[PDB]
Amino acid sequence: GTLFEVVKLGKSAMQSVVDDWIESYKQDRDIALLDLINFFIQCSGCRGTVRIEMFRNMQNAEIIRKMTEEFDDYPLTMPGPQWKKFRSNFCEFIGVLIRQCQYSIIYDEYMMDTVISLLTGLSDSQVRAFRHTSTLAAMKLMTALVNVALNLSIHQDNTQRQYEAERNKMIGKRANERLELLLQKRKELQENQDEIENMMNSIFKGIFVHRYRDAIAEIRAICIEEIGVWMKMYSDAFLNDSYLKYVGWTLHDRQGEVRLKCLKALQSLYTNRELFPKLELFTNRFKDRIVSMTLDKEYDVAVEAIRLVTLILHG
Ligand SMILES: CN(C(=O)[C@H]1CCNC1)c1ccccc1
């Protein structure tokens, strides 16, 4: 509208184009998902693009095989001023996309299933460009969903408090309308969080447990950093010995970049004198490796290992 109106309402090009994509998704899910598929293809530097006939007929396996052939050094590796902000932008786009879709579209069984299936497929590609782009996308996706789960939890607590105040207020009285709405609201929100847990499982089992072991050091670094982020954000789901294995194991990685990430992840956990209890078996298992890395070889890795060890000591 007016210049004052557009300034007082700071929609970035990303927020604006995610809002347009959502309007497009509501008119025609198929062309919207086709554009979202093409986005992830273009973001790998792949020169091909999927048309509706391929989308509606061909499996993701065939689409990826056909797009693999159309490959001429991809956006995420590019040096130059015109690609500086790409990684940061690509990451924020996925956050904005899912933040916006979090109350309706995410729970439709079509959109998240399409993306995750494409990303899982591209994460199994021989092409480094596809594996790098899809994995970083999946890692930021999981974190977007973890924030969705965090938001649900708040609404679940308020729906719970409201049901408690009504369940009490009745007692000896036939369960009125308000108590049946609240009892249904509460089922819905838990059923919503099951679907989020479901999507997180597909991403973890499909992408993470394969990509954290990837040939490319930067792909291993991307995975480790983000399981670190999930473990801090969403302690009860992600902070356990099964998931911690991956981070702790990777302390033996051959590259400074990756060993540096493992320590930064553990650092953020051990600062919180609260989930320190849940790190007791892990500290016992990997004290030797953590402690050894204080004289790592890579100065900066050693500095972090020392900072980690001084955090473990103080607790
Ligand atoms: C590496 N590790 C394991 O034993 C794996 C395999 C079975 N449980 C998880 C471990 C031990 C203590 C604390 C965290 C992880």
Swiss-Prot record:
Subcellular compartments: Nucleus; Chromosome; Chromosome, Centromere
Keywords: Cell cycle, Cell division, Centromere, Chromosome, Chromosome partition, Disease variant, Intellectual disability, Isopeptide bond, Mitosis, Nucleus, Phosphoprotein, Ubl conjugation
Signal peptide feature range: none
Location (main, coarse): nucleus
Superkingdom of source: Eukaryota
Biological process annotations from GO: cell division; establishment of mitotic sister chromatid cohesion; mitotic spindle assembly; sister chromatid cohesion
Any one GO molecular function term: chromatin binding
A GO cellular component entry from the record: cytosol
PTM info: Phosphorylated by PLK1. The large dissociation of cohesin from chromosome arms during prophase is partly due to its phosphorylation.
Domain SCD positions: 208-293
Family per similarity comment: Belongs to the SCC3 family.
Protein function: Component of cohesin complex, a complex required for the cohesion of sister chromatids after DNA replication. The cohesin complex apparently forms a large proteinaceous ring within which sister chromatids can be trapped. At anaphase, the complex is cleaved and dissociates from chromatin, allowing sister chromatids to segregate. The cohesin complex may also play a role in spindle pole assembly during mitosis.
Record's subunit section: Cohesin complexes are composed of a heterodimer between a SMC1 protein (SMC1A or SMC1B) and SMC3, which are attached via their hinge domain, and RAD21 which link them at their heads, and one STAG protein (STAG1, STAG2 or STAG3). In cohesin complexes, STAG1 is mutually exclusive with STAG2 and STAG3. Interacts directly with RAD21 in cohesin complex. The cohesin complex interacts with the cohesin loading complex subunits NIPBL/Scc2 (via HEAT repeats) and MAU2/Scc4. NIPBL directly contacts all members of the complex, RAD21, SMC1A/B, SMC3 and STAG1.
UniProt protein name: Cohesin subunit SA-1
Gene name for this UniProt entry: STAG1
Residues of the full protein shown: 86 to 403 of 1258
